[PDB]
């Protein structure tokens, strides 16, 4: 019909092929369910309207179906739209040295070329503003973007080229607060600066949780939604695609295993009761700070194979501390029903529990197909990417919640450099912790032997009241 004749031919432009059941599926603006990468780029830079939601979702999730170099090539190809040939009358006009009417050419420029070219520049602007890490990880991608942006000519393009350049430079420079004062830093046995004596029972339980909450808050806030899409932290190139997420996972593994190591490596029953009691006090302070990540690291350590089975140790734990620890576990029951009600009812600041997002993203990634097939053609399942993007959107709503707590660099460095496993692998280390648990509290028919004390200093806790 007339509509497709106005548009460029498929032999000169790939983004003008009409929609059909084998290139795009839908669920004022229609929501895209699936499509070829060409149809996704086309609707990303559609001429009829802007789509901020689809631009946001696409730039968070595109790396799961398209490489950054390929996306740049596609939006440049999209921008280079062929203009129609002059009509027969205008060909005669031009050949006579006269100005053509160019009515359709001007219409196509105003109603199609200009909107698409401005929509391509808007993708470029959102790309550098919210995903500049793609350009830091690939210097050549930035050379190509700056060459493209630097050669764009036009009246309406001028403002866009300058705002994209302002964002690029502002991001390059970024490479190189409190309304009230924070509480007084707490000390217990270990003195400020005597890092050689820093340990679970020597540092104040309040300050251990405060400094871990700052460290975990910082770790939580550095994770970018794209580190979670396509399960890329589980794939082979995980170290480049998911550096902040892997730091968050390694911290949680190291802290949880450190709590287990402190517990099972304390062979004396009375001393081990004090260690467990101190970790529950650390959890109580994580509850006061709304650090749900920390609360569930402690629950994870208490529910581990080596610790959960220590019946003689939990027998001596006061009922008040037992009920605190049992309620913290109930945050995880019924698919984290209680955790989610708590998270939505608290006031900021908080550190949400990170593991539940990883779990739900893996369930979405494993339970939805990468493509949808229609008439023998493969279409990228975009609604799969949108569901993962919605979950990572839940992460973001809590990434602007700084804590009014003073950093203590020595305690911060102690928790950053925790290495409970040492040179052992995780599986072999957890086998060791469980074999140590059987040593300190043997199975029922075998009796309970006594063990010598290892702590010279006192075991009494200073408490959780500041
Ligand atoms: C069905 O499996 C479980 C049910 C649980 N139910 C509750 C109420 N809490 C649990 N765990 C908490 C963190 C806990 C851990 C150690 C010791 C105590 C204390 F002795 F203090 F009570 C409490 C549970 C753990 C489970 O499996 C590992």
Curated annotation (Swiss-Prot):
Ras-GEF domain sequence ranges: 204-443
Limits of the N-terminal Ras-GEF domain: 28-172
Tissue specificity statement from the Swiss-Prot or TrEMBL entry: Expressed in gingival tissues.
Effect of residue 208 to T: In a patient with Noonan syndrome
Function statement: Promotes the exchange of Ras-bound GDP by GTP. Probably by promoting Ras activation, regulates phosphorylation of MAP kinase MAPK3/ERK1 in response to EGF. Catalytic component of a trimeric complex that participates in transduction of signals from Ras to Rac by promoting the Rac-specific guanine nucleotide exchange factor (GEF) activity.
Quaternary structure and interacting proteins, as annotated: Interacts (via C-terminus) with GRB2 (via SH3 domain). Forms a complex with phosphorylated MUC1 and GRB2 (via its SH3 domains). Interacts with phosphorylated LAT2. Interacts with NCK1 and NCK2. Part of a complex consisting of ABI1, EPS8 and SOS1.
Disease implicated: Fibromatosis, gingival, 1: A form of hereditary gingival fibromatosis, a rare condition characterized by a slow, progressive overgrowth of the gingiva. The excess gingival tissue can cover part of or the entire crown, and can result in diastemas, teeth displacement, or retention of primary or impacted teeth. GINGF1 is usually transmitted as an autosomal dominant trait, although sporadic cases are common.
Record-given protein name: Son of sevenless homolog 1
Organism field: Homo sapiens
Organism phylogeny: Eukaryota, Metazoa, Chordata, Craniata, Vertebrata
Gene name, Swiss-Prot/TrEMBL: SOS1
